[PDB]
C-alpha cells in the first residue's frame, strides 16, 4: 500500500519523497566527528511525513533533533547541529550553498 | 561407538567437555564448569511463549508500510526463520554425540529447545501479518538471496556430524572403506568441532544481532511493535546462547579443558579469523539486498554495515581474534535499550566589627 | 549424508515421518500429522521447574521411614534417575537424524528437553532427602539390579544410532569396511527404528508407571509429599510422551506413512511381543528386589506385580499386540488421582370433583 508522497522543495516545486537526501545531508554534517550517529538524529527527529511537506520544515526539525543530542558523552554534536544550521542559513539567504561575490552581494543589499 | 548409557562408572568432574566418555547418569548437584549450570537455570527462568505477546496491531502496520519497507521487514523475517531453523536441530545433532560432562549436555538440549520456541514464534509473527504464510515459507528455500548463506553455516555442522559418525563407527586410525582409504584423526575431529563452534558464535553473536537491528529499527518508529516484543525476548535468549559458545571456545582455546586443544586452537586461529570476517562480509552483502529498493528512517546500507563492523570487532575480541575492522563508535546507540533488561536572617554585629575595610 | 539444512525444496506435507528428506525450514502453520503439533503445545503448556515445589518436609518423612522403606523409596529413585537419564539424550540422538517432517522433529526435541527437567528434579529430590547425593548417584551405574536393564534399554537406541550412521556414511548397499563385508539395508534400518520405538513405548508406558505406583503409594500415606508433587508433574508429561510413541508406532504399523513399513511392522510383531513381555517380567523381578526386606501399607510384591500385568495389557493393546496376561481389574485404583486430571397451596375443587370414589 505505497502512497507515493510528495515533498515541497525550497523553490516551490514538488518531487517524490527520497530519504537518501536526508541521509546525505546528515552524513555530510557528521563527517570527521566522533561518537555521533546519523541513525540517532533521524529517529529522534520523529519527523511526521505528509504529502506536500515543506523541505525547510524537514531540515529545521533535524537541526533541533541533532541539537538536543549535544551531551557530555557526545560533545561533537555541537558541530553536527552547527553545520546543519550553517547549511540552512546559506539556502535561506542565497538559494544555494556557495555565497555570491562580495561585490555582487553589497550591490543588491 | 556412541552409547546412550555408558557402562563405565567415571568421575564426571574429571572428564573433558568433549570426546570423553559419553555421559551416563545425569546429575546436577555438581559441575566441572558451573557456567553451563547457570546458563541452564537462566534459560529456564526466561521461558516464554509467542502467543503471550499481542501481535494484532502488527498486521495493520505491515500493510500500511511502503512497499520496500515490506521488503526489508519480510526479508529480515525470512532470514531469521532460516537461521533459527538450523539452530533448532543442529546443536542437538552435532554436539550431543560428543559431549562428555552432564551440565554441558543438558545445556545444549536446553539451548536447542529454546531455539524451537524462536522457530515457533516466527511462524506466529508470519501468520499474523500475511494472508498466506505458505508464500513466505516457500520463498525461504527457493529464493536465491537467502539459501546461499544457509549452506555456509550448515556446512560446518554437516562436516562435524560426518567425521563424528566415522569416529564412532571406525574409531581413530587409517581405514579402507569400499577400497578407498579413509583416515580418522581425532585431532582433525577436535579441529572440526572448534571451527563449528566458531561458526555458531559468529551466527548467534553477529548475524542475528544484525537482524535485531532491523526489527528494533521499526520499533523505534513505533511500528511492528508486536514483532519487536518477540524479537526482544529472542534477543535475551540469544545473549545466553552466544555466552555458551564463547565459554566453550575460550575453555578449549586456553587448554584448561584439553591441553591438546590449545595447539589445535592455534592451527585454526587463521581459519577462525577468516571465518568471522567472512560472516561480516556476508551480512554486509545481505544488507545490500535489504535496501536494494530503498531505505527507511534510521537505517540504510551504510548504517547497518557500520553496525556489522562494530559488533564484529566486539565478538571477535571476546574469543581472542584480531580485530578486522577499524575502531568505531556504536552507529546505532538506540539498540542497547532492547538488548538488556531560604535565608537565615540572624546577624552577628560583633563578628562584623572584627573586620577591617 | 545427513544435512542440517537440505537445499531441495520439498513439500513437507508429503514427506514420511522417518527416512525422507531431512527437514529444512521449521514451520508450524501446517502439519502432515497434527498429533505431534498438539503434543508440542500441550507439553509447552505443562512447563514446570523443580525448585517451584517445596520438598523440605520430605527429609523428615524419609528419615522416619523404616530401613526397608528407605530402600524401596531410594531404589525407585535411582531407577527413575537412570531411565530419564537415557530419555534425556536418546530421542535427540537417535531420532533427529531420521525425522523428515517438521512437526515431528520439534516434538522430539521438546520431548527430550522435558526429560531433562525430570533429570533435574531427581537431583532436586535427592539433595533434599539424603545427606550426600553422591551416595545415590554413584550407585546408579554399578547397581546390579539396575545395570541389567540399563544396558538392555540403551542397546535398542545404540543399535539404531549405529545403523543410522552407516546409512548416512555409506548409503544402502553391500560395502566393505576394513576387509569385512558390511551390508546396509534401509529395510533393516526401518526395522531397528520400529523395534526401538516399541522399546521406548514399553519404557515410558509400563516401566515408569510401575515406578509411579511406588512414588504415589508413599503419598497415599501422606509421606514424601514433595516428591509426590514432582512425580505427579512427571506423570503428566509421561502421558504425553507415550502418546507420541503410540501414534508413531500405529502410523508406521498401519502403513499410512510408509507402505513398506506396514510389512516390516508385521515381521516384528513377534519380537515386539517378546520385548514387552520381557520388560513386564523384568519389572516383576525389580518388584521382587524392592520388597526383599519387607513391604509397606498398600504395596507389596503381589500388588505391584499385579499392576505390572494390568498396565502391560493396556499398553500392548494400544499398539496392536496380543495381551500376554490374564484380564484383571486395576489393583491400585488410587493411582488414578495422580495420573489423570414449599407447596403450591392452590386447589381446584372442580378437578377434584371430577373423580369417583
Ligand atoms: C556544501 C556541501 C554539501 N554537500 C552535500 C550536502 C547535500 O546533501 C548535497 C548538496 O545538496 P543539493 O545540491 O541541494 O542536493 P539535493 O540532494 O538536495 O538535490 P536537489 O536540491 O538537486 O534536488 O551535497 C557536499 O557533499 N559537499 C559540500 O561541500
Ligand atoms: N526529495 C526529498 N525528500 C525528503 N527530504 C528531502 C528531499 N530533498 C531534500 N530533502 C531534505 C534534505 C535536507 O536535510 C533538507 C534541505 O534540503 P535542501 O537541499 O536545502 O533543499 P532542496 O533540495 O529542497 O532545495 O531537505
Ligand atoms: Mg537540495
Alpha-carbon distances of B147 from B10, B86, C15, C56, rounded to whole Å: 44, 12, 21, 53
DSSP B276-343: HHHHHHHHHHHHHHHTTT--BTTB-HHHHHHHHHHHHHHHHHHTT----S-----S-GGGGGTS----
Helix axes C144-169, B144-169, angle to 10 degrees: 130
Report the catalytic residues of C: 122
d(CA B296, CA B287): 13
Cβ–Cβ < 8 Å for C117, C140: no
Q: Which residue of C has its CA nearest to B4?
A: C154
Does the beta carbon of A26 lie inside 6 Å of ligand 1? no
Catalytic positions of B, written as ranges: 122
Nearest atom within ligand 2 for CA of residue A88: 20
CA distances from A85 to A12, A23, A89, C38, C146 (A): 21, 16, 6, 61, 81
Ligand in closest contact with the CA of A88: 2
Residues 215-244, chain B, touching A (beta carbon < 8 A):
217, 220-221
Q: Confirm if C311 and C280 have CB atoms less than 8 A apart.
A: no
Q: Exposed, middle or buried: residue B29 (CB in 10 Å: 0-12, 13-18, 19+)?
A: middle
Quote the CA–CA distance of A17 and A6 in Å, as a whole number. Answer: 5
Residues 296-355 of B with CB under 8 A from C: none
Q: Whose CA is nearest to atom 15 of ligand 2?
A: A59
Number of domains comprising chain B: 1
Distance between CA atoms of residues B79 and B97, nearest Å = 28
**Chain A residues with CB-CB distance to B297 below 8 A:** 19, 42-43, 45, 47
State the DSSP string of A20-75.
HHHHHHHHHHTTT-SS--HHHHHHHHT----TTEEHHHHHHHHHHHHHTT--SS-T
Q: C235 near C339, Cβ under 8 Å?
A: yes
The Cα–Cα gap between C108 and C91 comes to 6
Sign, CA dihedral C114-C116-C120-C122, equals positive
Distance CA B301, CA C294 (A): 76
Helix axes B225-253 and B102-126, enclosed angle (nearest 10): 160
3-state secondary structure C220-231: CCCCCHHHHHHH
Please check whether residue C13 touches B, CB under 8 A.
no
Grid coordinates representing A53?
Answer: 511537506
> CB of B228 within 8 A of CB of B347?
no
Alpha carbon distance A19, A40 (integer Å): 15
Task: Among B219, B302, B333, B334, pick the best mutation site for testing chain A contact (most A Cβ within 10 A).
Answer: B333
CA distance C87 to B222: 45
Dihedral (CA of C247, C251, C252, C254) sign: positive
DSSP 8-state symbol, B65: S
Query: Do residues C137 and C81 lie in contact, with contact meaning Cβ atoms separated by under 8 Å?
Result: yes
Burial C254-281, CB ≥16 within 10 A → b, else e: eeebbeebeebbeebeeebbebbbebbe
- What is the number of CB-based contacts under 8 A between chain A and chain B? 48
Listed residue (B315, B245, B292) closest to B67, CA to CA: B292
Q: What gap in Å lies between CA B249 and CA B320, rounded to an integer? A: 9
- Chain B hits for A43, CB-CB cut-off 8 Å, are 217, 220-221, 297-298, 334
CA distance, residue A55 to nearest chain B CA (Å): 16
CB atoms within 10 A of CB A12: 7
Distance from C-alpha of B87 to C-alpha of B348, rounded to nearest angstrom: 80
Q: To one decimal place, what's the resolution in Å?
A: 3.2
Protein residue closest via CA to atom 16 of ligand 2: A59
Q: Quick check: B130 and B136 in contact, CB under 8 A?
A: yes
* Contact by Cβ (8 Å): C324, C255: no
Q: Positive or negative, the Cα torsion across C335, C114, C81, C137?
A: negative
A108 in reach of chain B (CB within 8 A): no
CB B301 within 8 A of CB B287: yes
Distance CA C112, CA C119 (A): 11
Does A34 reach chain B within 8 Å, measured CB to CB?
Answer: yes
The answer to whether residue B103 neighbours chain C at the CB level (below 8 Å) is no
What CATH number has the domain bearing residue B187? 1.10.620.20
**Interchain contact C133–B (C-beta under 8 A):** yes
B-C interface (Cβ pairs under 8 Å ≥ 3): yes
Ligand at shortest distance from the CA of A59: 2
Nearest CA to ligand 1 atom 6: A25
In this structure, the number of other CB atoms found within 10 A of the CB of residue B220 comes to 22
> What gap in Å lies between CA C320 and CA C313, rounded to an integer?
11
Alpha-carbon span C125 to C5, nearest angstrom: 40
Q: Is C38 on the interface with B (CB under 8 A)?
A: no
- Which residue in chain C is spatially nearest to B22 when comparing CA positions? C89
Cβ-proximal residues to A66 (8 Å cutoff; 6+ apart), any chain: A26, A29, A41, A77, A80, A81, A84
**Which residues of chain A have a CB within 8 Å of the CB of B294?**
19
Q: Do C112 and B92 touch (CB under 8 A)?
A: yes
Q: Do B29 and C127 touch (CB under 8 A)?
A: yes
Residue where the block lists cell 552409547: B3
Q: B169 by DSSP, 3-state: which? A: helix
Cα A58 to ligand 3 centre (Å)? 12
**Residue for grid cell 488421582:** C337
Residue that is written with C-alpha cell 508406532 in the block: C249
Three-state secondary-structure class, residue B55 = coil
Q: Which candidate from B92, B123, B141 shows the least CB-CB separation from C24?
A: B141
- CB C4 within 8 Å of CB B157: yes
From the CB of A97, is ligand 1 less than 6 Å away?
Answer: yes
Angle of helix B186-202 relative to helix B144-169, nearest 10 degrees, comes to 150
Asked whether the beta carbons of residue B142 and residue C9 sit closer than 8 angstroms, the reply is yes
The answer to whether A63 and A81 are in contact (CB under 8 A) is yes
Q: How far is CA C245 from CA B330, C139, C261, in A?
A: 51, 30, 15
Query: How far apart are alpha carbons B312 and B323 in whole angstroms?
Result: 8
Could you tell me the distance, in angstroms and rounded to a whole number, from the CA of residue A9 to the centre of ligand 3?
A: 8
A17 belongs to an annotated ligand binding site: yes
Strand B173-177 and strand B180-184: pairing? antiparallel
Tell me the technique behind this structure. X-ray
Q: In what order do the strands lie in the sheet with C180-184?
A: B180-184, B173-177, C173-177, C180-184
Query: Which residue is it, cell 505391584?
Result: C304
CB C118 within 8 A of CB C48: no
Strands C180-184, B180-184: pairing is unpaired
- Tell me the C-alpha distance between C306 and C106, whole Å: 37
Distance A68 CA to ligand 1 centre (A): 24
Q: Which atom of ligand 1 is least distant from the CA of A97?
A: 1
Nearest to B278 by CA among B190, B207, B189: B207
C-alpha cell recorded at residue C260 = 513398506
Can you tell me whether residue B351 is helix, strand or coil? helix
Closest-lying ligand 2 atom to the alpha carbon of residue A16: 1
SS3 string, chain C, reads CCCCCCCCCCCHHHCCCECCCCCCCCCCCCCCCHHHHHHHHHHHHCCCCHHHCCCCCHHHHHHHCCHHHHHHHHHHHHHHHHHHHHHHHHHHHHHCCCECCHHHHHHHHHHHHHHHHHHHHHHHHHCCCCCCHHHHHHHHHHCHHHHHHHHHHHHHHHHHHHHHHHHHHCCCEEEEECCEEEEECHHHHHHHHHHHHHHHHHHHHHHHHHHHHHHHHHHCCCCCHHHHHHHHHHHHHHHHHHHHHHHHHHHHHCCCCCHHHHHHHHHHHHHHHHHHHHHHHHHHHHHHHHCCCCCECCECHHHHHHHHHHHHHHHHHHCCCCCCCCCCCCCCHHHHHHHCCCCCCCCCHHHHHCCCC
Q: Please, are residues C99 and C15 in contact by the beta-carbon 8 Å criterion?
A: no
Binding site annotation covers A51?
A: no
Rounded-to-integer distance, Cα C284 and Cα C312, Å? 11
| Ligand 3 centroid – CA B299 distance (Å) | 21
Q: What's the CA gap between C7 and B120, in Å, rounded?
A: 21
Contact B23 C89 (CB under 8 A): yes
In the block, which residue shows the cell 526489527?
B215
SS3 at position B146: helix
β-sheet bridge partners, residue C193: none
Radius of gyration of chain B (CA): 26
Instruction: Kindly state the cell numbers that stand for B127.
Output: 501468520
Q: Which atom of ligand 1 is nearest to the CA of A91?
A: 14
Q: The C-alpha cell of B102 is what? A: 552432564
Residue carrying C-alpha cell 534399554: C153
Cell for C163? 545403523
Answer yes or no: is the C-beta of A66 below 6 A from any ligand 2 atom.
no
In the reported structure, the alpha carbon of residue A21 is separated from the centroid of ligand 1 by a whole-number distance in angstroms of: 8
Nearest to residue B2, comparing CAs of B117, B136, B105? B105
Distance from the alpha carbon of residue B153 to the mean position of ligand 3, in angstroms: 44
The rounded distance, in Å, linking the Cα atoms of A62 and A42 is 7
Alpha-carbon torsion angle C234, C240, C243, C244, nearest 10: -110
Handedness of CA C124, C128, C134, C138 (dihedral sign): negative
Cα–Cα distance between B85 and B89 in angstroms, integer?
7
C311 touches C210 (CB < 8 A) = yes
- Distance in Å, CA B289 to ligand 3 centroid: 27
What are the CA-CA distances from residue C80 to residues B3, B12, B37 (Å)?
Answer: 19, 20, 21
What atom of ligand 1 comes closest to residue A87's alpha carbon?
A: 1
Which residues in C2-37 are b (16+ Cβ under 10 Å) and which e? bbbbbeeebebeebbbbbbbbbbbbbbeebbbebbb
Contact B184, B170 (CB under 8 A): yes
Question: B332 CA to chain A: closest CA distance, Å?
Answer: 6
Q: Which of B65, B66, B296, B327 to mutate to test the interface with A (most CBs of A within 10 A)?
A: B66
Task: Compute the distance between CA of residue C259 and CA of residue C25 in angstroms, rounded to an integer.
Answer: 26
Contact C179 B178 (CB under 8 A): no
Q: What is the distance between the alpha carbons of residues B151 and B136, in angstroms, rounded to a whole number?
A: 20
The DSSP bridge partners found for residue A53 are A7
Name the residue range of residue B29's domain.
Answer: 1-357
Distances (CA, A) of C216 to C54, C213, C228, C279: 16, 5, 6, 21
What whole-number distance in Å separates Cα of residue C229 and Cα of residue B61? 46
Cβ <8 Å between B333 and A1: no
Place of cell 520496500: B68
Note the Cα B330 to chain centre separation in Å. 20
Phi-psi region of C294 (alpha: psi -120 to 50; beta: other; left: phi over 0): left
Residues on chain A touching B220 (C-beta within 8 angstroms) = 43
The rounded radius of gyration (Å) of the Cα atoms in chain A is 16
For residue B357, with 0-12 CB atoms within 10 Å meaning exposed, 13-18 middle and 19 or more buried, which class applies? exposed
- The span from the CA of C45 to the CA of B334, in Å, is 35
Residues in B closer than 8 angstroms to C168, CB to CB, are: 162, 165
Mutate to test the interface with C, among B42, B89, B121 (most CBs of C within 10 A): B89
Q: Which residue of B has its CA nearest to A34?
A: B329
Q: How far is CA C175 from CA B44, B130, B171, C178, C185, in A?
A: 46, 50, 18, 10, 11
Nearest to C9 among B8, B120, B141 (CB): B141
Amino acid at each position: 500500500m505505497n502512497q507515493n508522497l510528495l515533498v515541497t522543495k525550497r523553490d516551490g516545486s514538488t518531487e517524490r519523497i527520497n530519504l537518501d537526501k536526508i541521509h546525505r545531508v546528515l552524513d555530510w554534517a557528521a563527517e570527521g566527528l566522533h561518537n555521533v550517529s546519523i541513525s540517532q538524529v533521524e529517529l529522534r527527529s520523529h519527523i511526521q511525513f505528509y504529502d506536500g511537506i515543506k523541505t525547510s520544515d524537514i531540515h529545521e526539525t533535524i537541526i533541533k533533533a541533532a541539537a538536543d543530542l549535544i551531551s557530555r558523552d557526545a560533545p561533537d554534536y555541537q558541530y553536527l547541529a552547527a553545520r546543519l544550521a550553517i547549511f540552512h542559513l546559506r539556502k535561506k539567504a542565497y538559494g544555494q550553498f556557495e555565497p555570491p561575490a562580495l561585490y555582487d552581494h553589497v550591490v543588491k543589499m | 561407538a556412541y552409547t546412550t548409557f555408558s557402562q563405565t562408572k567415571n568421575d564426571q568432574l574429571k572428564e573433558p567437555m568433549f570426546f570423553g566418555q559419553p555421559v551416563n547418569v545425569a546429575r546436577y548437584d555438581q559441575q566441572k564448569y558451573d557456567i553451563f549450570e547457570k546458563l541452564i537455570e537462566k534459560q529456564l527462568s526466561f521461558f516464554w511463549r509467542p502467543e503471550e505477546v499481542d501481535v494484532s496491531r502488527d498486521r495493520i502496520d505491515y500493510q500500511a508500510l511502503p512497499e520496500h519497507e515490506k521488503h526489508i521487514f519480510i526479508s529480515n523475517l525470512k532470514y531469521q526463520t532460516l537461521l533459527d531453523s538450523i539452530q533448532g536441530r543442529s546443536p542437538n545433532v552435532a554436539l550431543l554425540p560428543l559431549i562428555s560432562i552432564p551440565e554441558l549436555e543438558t545445556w545444549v538440549e536446553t539451548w536447542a529447545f529454546s531455539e524451537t520456541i524462536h522457530s515457533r514464534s516466527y511462524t506466529h509473527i508470519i501468520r499474523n501479518i500475511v494472508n498466506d504464510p505458505s508464500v513466505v515459507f516457500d520463498d525461504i528455500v527457493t529464493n536465491e538471496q537467502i539459501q546461499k548463506r544457509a549452506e555456509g553455516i550448515s556446512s560446518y555442522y554437516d562436516e562435524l556430524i560426518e567425521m563424528t559418525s566415522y569416529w564412532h563407527l571406525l574409531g581413530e586410525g587409517t581405514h579402507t572403506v569400499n577400497g578407498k582409504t579413509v583416515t580418522v584423526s581425532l585431532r582433525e575431529l577436535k579441529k572440526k568441532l572448534y571451527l563449528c563452534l566458531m561458526s555458531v558464535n559468529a551466527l548467534e553473536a553477529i548475524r542475528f544481532y544484525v537482524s535485531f537491528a532491523c526489527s528494533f529499527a521499526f520499533a523505534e518508529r513505533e511500528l511492528m511493535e508486536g514483532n519487536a516484543k518477540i524479537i526482544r525476548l529472542i534477543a535475551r535468549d540469544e545473549a545466553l546462547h552466544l555466552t555458551g559458545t564463547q565459554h566453550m571456545l575460550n575453555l578449549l582455546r586456553s587448554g584448561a579443558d584439553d591441553p591438546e586443544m590449545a595447539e589445535i586452537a592455534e592451527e585454526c586461529k587463521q581459519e577462525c579469523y577468516d571465518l568471522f570476517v567472512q560472516a561480516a562480509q556476508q551480512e554486509k552483502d545481505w544488507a545490500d539486498y535489504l535496501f536494494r529498493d530503498g531505505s527507511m528512517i534510521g537505517l540504510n546500507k551504510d548504517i547497518l554495515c557500520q553496525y556489522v563492523e562494530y559488533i564484529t570487532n566486539i565478538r571477535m575480541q571476546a574469543v581472542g581474534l584480531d580485530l578486522p575492522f577499524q575502531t568505531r563508535s556504536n552507529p546505532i546507540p538506540w539498540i542497547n535499550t532492547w538488548l538488556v533488561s531560604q535565608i537565615d536572617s540572624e546577624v552577628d554585629t560583633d563578628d562584623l566589627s572584627n573586620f577591617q575595610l
